[PDB]
Amino acid sequence: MTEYKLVVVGAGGVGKSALTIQLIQNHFVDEYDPTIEDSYRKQVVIDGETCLLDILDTAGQEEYILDTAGQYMRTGEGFLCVFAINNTKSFEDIHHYREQIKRVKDSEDVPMVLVGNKCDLPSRTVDTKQAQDLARSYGIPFIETSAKTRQGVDQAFYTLVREIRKHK
């Protein structure tokens, strides 16, 4: 069975964990420890093809990342770059995560999708047009999602898988 290692990155609080849990477990989580980084697997069918999705949900903040206990970006085949549409700071930070991915992969050609999450919220501050302009400058798809309503959730992950299949 074909395996796809996807990595979800972005600023703290944008919904990386909520997006992952919604895709895998079909439930919206109202809170999820921001320091929890883990892989979540689920068998899906995308465009008729069976595959095993391995999703690495990252913390997004060095503060949360190192908040460990008694205990990759390298192995990831595609990346979801998430901001929240009611979080201008998370959008302003997207370039940092984009540069991180290219550095850790030593490539300009990495499968990647820009995700604008929380589109169920009315207090929007990032316009769809400006997120689209940013995605065009990277040459990557832009997808609006809501981990709460499920809008765009499958589409964001499936598009990333399709970008990986295109990348061979």
Ligand X SMILES: Nc1nc2c(ncn2[C@@H]2O[C@H](COP(=O)(O)OP(=O)(O)O)[C@@H](O)[C@H]2O)c(=O)[nH]1
For the bound state, the minimum distance from the C-beta of residue 30 to ligand X, rounded and expressed in Å, comes to 5
Comparing CB distances to ligand X, the nearer of 132 and 151 is 151
Structure tokens at 164: 């990986």
- When asked if residue 153 is in the footprint of ligand X (CB under 6 A), the reply is no
Angle at 101 between CA 28 and CA 16, to 5 degrees: 10
Whether 3 has a binding-site annotation, put simply, is no
Residues 8-67 that bind Mg ion (CB under 5 A): 16-17
For the bound state, the minimum distance from the C-beta of residue 34 to Mg ion, rounded and expressed in Å, comes to 5
Residue in this structure with the two tokens 């995560």, named with its chain if needed: 97
Where does this chain touch ligand X (CB under 6 A) — which range of 73-81, 91-99, 104-112, 144-152? 144-152
Per-position x/- string for 17-56, each x denoting binding to ligand X as judged by CB under 6 A, each - no binding: xx----------xxxx-x----------------------
Structure tokens at 101: 């991915």
Indicate the DSSP class of residue 167: T
From candidates 6, 7, 9, 14, binder to ligand X by CB under 6 A: 14
From candidates 37, 94, 101, 118, binder to ligand X by CB under 6 A: 118
Beta strands in 12-108 (DSSP E): 38-46, 49-57, 78-84
Residue 152, helix vs strand vs coil: coil
Beta strands in 97-159 (DSSP E): 112-117, 142-144
Closest CA to 17 of 82, 79, 75: 82
Binding site for ligand X (CB under 6 A): 10, 12-18, 29-32, 34, 60, 117-118, 120-121, 146-148
Interacting residues toward Mg ion by CB under 5 A: 16-17
